[PDB]
Every structure is written in C-alpha cells, then in structure tokens.
Design an enzyme around this catalytic site. Structure first.
Site, PDB file in Angstrom:
ATOM      1  CG  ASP A 200     -12.785 -32.946 109.354  1.00 26.75           C
ATOM      2  OD1 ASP A 200     -11.585 -32.845 109.680  1.00 26.75           O
ATOM      3  OD2 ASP A 200     -13.293 -32.371 108.387  1.00 26.75           O
TER       4      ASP A 200
ATOM      5  CG  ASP B 295     -10.577 -26.319 108.512  1.00 23.62           C
ATOM      6  OD1 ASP B 295     -11.167 -25.669 109.404  1.00 23.62           O
ATOM      7  OD2 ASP B 295      -9.388 -26.122 108.188  1.00 23.62           O
TER       8      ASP B 295
ATOM      9  CG  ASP C  88     -14.900 -32.201 104.735  1.00 26.01           C
ATOM     10  OD1 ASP C  88     -14.020 -32.679 105.470  1.00 26.01           O
ATOM     11  OD2 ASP C  88     -14.741 -31.137 104.097  1.00 26.01           O
TER      12      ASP C  88
HETATM   13  O1  2M8 Z   1      -5.613 -31.513 104.493  1.00 32.22           O
HETATM   14  C1  2M8 Z   1      -6.040 -30.431 104.050  1.00 32.22           C
HETATM   15  O2  2M8 Z   1      -6.543 -30.331 102.904  1.00 32.22           O
HETATM   16  C2  2M8 Z   1      -6.377 -29.403 105.090  1.00 32.22           C
HETATM   17  C3  2M8 Z   1      -7.776 -29.654 105.637  1.00 32.22           C
HETATM   18  O3  2M8 Z   1      -7.749 -30.850 106.424  1.00 32.22           O
HETATM   19  O4  2M8 Z   1      -5.466 -29.510 106.181  1.00 32.22           O
HETATM   20  C4  2M8 Z   1      -4.189 -28.953 105.908  1.00 32.22           C
HETATM   21  O5  2M8 Z   1      -4.336 -27.577 105.565  1.00 32.22           O
HETATM   22  C5  2M8 Z   1      -4.972 -26.807 106.594  1.00 32.22           C
HETATM   23  C6  2M8 Z   1      -5.202 -25.388 106.079  1.00 32.22           C
HETATM   24  O6  2M8 Z   1      -5.954 -25.454 104.860  1.00 32.22           O
HETATM   25  C7  2M8 Z   1      -4.149 -26.821 107.885  1.00 32.22           C
HETATM   26  O7  2M8 Z   1      -4.849 -26.056 108.892  1.00 32.22           O
HETATM   27  C8  2M8 Z   1      -3.861 -28.262 108.324  1.00 32.22           C
HETATM   28  O8  2M8 Z   1      -2.905 -28.316 109.392  1.00 32.22           O
HETATM   29  C9  2M8 Z   1      -3.328 -29.105 107.150  1.00 32.22           C
HETATM   30  O9  2M8 Z   1      -2.014 -28.696 106.792  1.00 32.22           O
HETATM   31 MG    MG Z   2     -12.257 -31.631 106.617  1.00 32.43          MG
END
Ligand code: 2M8
Ligand code: MG
Ligand code: 2M8
Ligand code: MG
Lengths: 253, 253
Positions: free
Chosen positions: A6, A8, A202
């Site tokens: 993954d 972020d 995560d």
């Molecule tokens: O699912 C989420 O909580 C976040 C982290 O995976 O992704 C969304 O939010 C992200 C930004 O926080 C975007 O970059 C992704 O495309 C998605 O919309």
């Molecule tokens: Mg993540």
C-alpha cells in the site's frame, strides 16, 4: 520474492514522503526485489508519484502493466497495457443513485464534488484532487458517521461492495486488492519470483491484500488483523522495520 | 397593497407549477396589485421563471429593482438596480471553511457540488441546478440529519447565521426576508401603496417575512405561527384561498 505494498500510511507518510522507508526501498531494489504498489489511488495519482508499472489502482479495480510485459494480457494504452477487474466508475455511480433512493437520503462521493471541495476535504492541492477525481472503477464516498451503517447496508442492499481506505469509505464491485494481487502473481514472467509474496498495508482495504500474500505485515495504528505481523511503529517506520527485520534476513539465502 | 410572497411551497407546487394559483396571480395583476417574490432562489432562477423586478433573492440577501425605479438606491447592474443587504457568497464560503475546521467534519454546500449533484438532490434539471448554484449571498447546505445541530452551532460560533427553506438549511450573514421586505417598502416609489403589506409563505425562512408585513398568511403544513393566518389547504391552493377570501375583500374597501 515480490513486495506488494500500500502507499499512503504504509510506504508514504502524511507529506506523501518516503521518510525512513526510502533507504529500505532502495535496498529492496538493490537486491532485485520487485515492489508493486497496490493502492486506492487512481492511475493519474500513481503516475504523479513517478511510479512505474506494474501497479494496481483503485483498490484492485485496475491492473496496469508495462506495454512490453512478457506475458500477454489487457489493453494497449500508450506506454501501458491495462487489465480491468472491477465494474466501471460511471456504472458504480449508477448503483449509488439506486442506493440513495433505497436509503432515502443523499449518498455523496468524489464524483459529486468539485476538485476544490475534494482538495479541501483531503488537504491535497487542486491538481492532486483533480487526479484523485479521475476514477475508473472505485468511488470514494464522503459519509457522515451516523448514516455510515445506514449507507453501508443500503450499499450492501443494492449489490455494491464497500471498504475503507483509512479516512474514507469506498464503493465498488469486484475491486479487491487481494484479487488484483492474485492475478498479477499469476501473470508474473518468472513464476519462481512470484512464488513468495509479501504484503504491507495499514487499513481495512488491505485485509484482502494480507490474505493474498505469504508474509503479511500490518503497519497501521492499533492492533493488526488476525495472524498478520505488526511493527512497533506505523507507516514508513513500519515499512523500514518490516524490510530490515522480516525481509532482508530471508533474502540473504 | 403590496403582496410579498414566497415561491416554492407557496406560489408554486412541488413540480414548480402555479397550479390553482394561476388565476389568483392573474387577478392580482389585472387589478394592479404589485406582487413581489421573496425567495431563497437566486436571481438567475427568478429570471428563468420569467419574473420581472422588483424581487428579493437568496433569503433577503439582495433586493433587485428595475433600473428605472424612481427611488435611486443601490447600484446599477444591467437592467436592474441592486441593493446588497448581505455578505457576498465568497465571504460566506470562506467563513464556512472556518465553521468546518471548528466542527471537525465536512460542511458541504452547493458551492462544493457539481451541477449534476445539485440536480440529483433537488430533482431539478441540470440547467436549473446551474441556476441554483449561481449564488451571490446565501449558501445552501447539504447536511447529515444527525449532524445538523453541531453544524448550526459551529456556524453561529464563527459569526454566520442560518435558516431553513423547507428542505435545506442555508448559511449567510445579513440575509433576512423581513429586513429585505422592510427595506423594499421603504424604497417603494408609492408610499401609500407600501403602507399595507401582505406576506405569504410556508417555511422557517418565512417567519421574518410574516413579522415584516401587516397581513401574514401561512400556507405550509401543520399549524401557523402565532399571529399568522392559516388556510384550509397548503401551497398554491392556500395562495388561491388567501387571494380570494383574504386579499380581494381588503382591497375592495
Ligand atoms: O481511502 C482513503 O482513505 C484514502 C487513502 O487510501 O484514499 C482516498 O483518498 C486519497 C487522499 O486522501 C486519494 O489519494 C485516493 O484516491 C482515495 O480517494
Ligand atoms: Mg493506506
Ligand atoms: O431552501 C430550500 O428548502 C429550497 C426551497 O426553495 O431552496 C433551495 O433549494 C431550491 C431547490 O429545491 C433552490 O431553487 C434554491 O435556490 C435553494 O437552493
Ligand atoms: Mg417556500
């Protein structure tokens, strides 16, 4: 060994930086270990991070391969060949409209929001939000807590699947990180290399990832999913720890 | 006599049709009785309904007068003179970002939504939704039912005001239907004619309208506010009864 990870909150921090994980990633590359991003992010977002194929987008919705991948599959798109695993976005948005009528209240997602709003909600730049809105399979929902279960069942009621990426709920159908990983491994040029898979994540949307790999590592906050390895610290520090403590010693073989 | 009237739920039915109120309107016009819309709608929406000034938009945020109006007030803008009573939308939107930071939860308004999304939530066409999005003073909010009170408290704590228009809450600063009606009466070219005002409405945002007129008529559902007349049926049917049984006799004497 192949490392499926993954982005972020795993390989990247809140800045979207590698931080302590940079050295770890460089070591894996030095050792010839493929590292495959498996992300909720769109293709446009992944490209903007400078990441090269192969990678998996939108929670397993799409599998992107190099145009010249040795094993044939997918559809030509510039320097890419693309494999689709989940339903298309504009169609998902259609089931959402059905769920809305069933729930008797609005269900909003990125598709309903301007880039400016998405940027504000996520803390991204306007350009980065435009990239996050460029969805092909998966919708990111913006729900308020109390309706969450209400909405989630309404979603489940109309045959959509949902998950959670750490901050937002998502809606799709057939988009599954574990399914995408399974397929990618099946399509790997060197079956021997794909024989042992590592998965780092995560969030809830990484559970399928964990079940599709041979060595799963949770770098999220709180307690790790059943049987999955954990790390003393979350995020990139976790990634680094996982590589040092769990991966590097096995590669010395 | 001047008749100040709300639009949706009062003069128009849920389909936006005059219904039983058409002959009532024609009768007022045939008798030279000014009818002044006082609405949550934007100027663009009012124009699309074919209504000529004077009229009051966005819950009292702006008074639109014929440019050739004998009493010079406000500033010229094309075929109108505009008297701005409320903060501009841009200022309200900026302050909404602060209420959102305080609330710790998204606070979405029309400004955050695509025309397509606004259309879906209102049952309007996309073109109609674009007109509803062209706001100059007031923001229309799309709030989770369960989060309403927290949001309204946050709005007030950061210096904004709110009301409810029948289906949605609104945020603004200085937009009040009553203040706007009072100002228009004060600017009326014929003071004698403005001496007796009728006000018809159906929602919370019309309570100030009722206070600002001499004969108030409620055509919403349930019982009317204290000091305000009801009619046998709500909506345009109530408008019709009011005109026939309350107004035309007052006039005839
Ligand atoms: O699912 C989420 O909580 C976040 C982290 O995976 O992704 C969304 O939010 C992200 C930004 O926080 C975007 O970059 C992704 O495309 C998605 O919309
Ligand atoms: Mg993540
Ligand atoms: O406040 C509401 O409940 C309604 C009632 O008129 O007004 C809003 O909603 C209307 C559409 O239902 C728009 O025409 C207005 O501009 C405004 O956004
Ligand atoms: Mg109304």
């Amino acid at each position: 060994m192949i490392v499926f990870t993954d982005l972020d909150g795993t390989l990247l921090d809140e800045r979207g930086e590698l931080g302590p994980a940079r050295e770890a990633l460089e070591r894996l590359r030095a050792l010839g270990v493929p590292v495959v991003p498996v992300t909720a992010k769109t293709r446009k977002e992944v490209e903007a991070l400078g990441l090269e194929p192969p990678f998996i987008v939108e929670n397993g919705g799409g599998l992107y391969l190099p145009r010249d991948w040795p094993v044939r599959a997918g559809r030509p798109k510039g320097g890419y060949r693309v494999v689709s695993l989940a339903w298309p976005y504009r169609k998902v948005r259609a089931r959402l409209r059905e769920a809305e009528a069933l729930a008797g209240r609005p269900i909003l997602g990125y598709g309903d929001l301007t880039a400016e709003a998405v940027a504000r909600l996520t803390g991204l730049s306007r350009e980065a939000a435009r990239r996050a809105k460029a969805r092909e399979y998966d919708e990111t929902l913006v729900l308020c807590p109390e309706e969450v279960e209400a909405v989630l069942e309404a979603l489940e009621a109309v045959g959509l699947e949902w998950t959670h990426g750490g901050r937002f709920y998502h809606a799709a159908k057939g988009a599954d990180k574990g399914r995408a990983v399974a397929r990618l491994r099946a399509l790997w040029p060197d079956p021997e290399e794909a024989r042992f898979a590592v998965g780092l994540g995560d969030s809830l949307n990484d559970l399928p990832l964990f079940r599709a790999v041979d060595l799963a590592v949770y770098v999220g906050r709180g307690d790790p999913p059943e049987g999955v390895l954990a790390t003393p610290a979350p995020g990139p520090e976790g990634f680094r720890y996982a590589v040092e403590r769990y991966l590097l010693p096995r590669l010395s073989r």
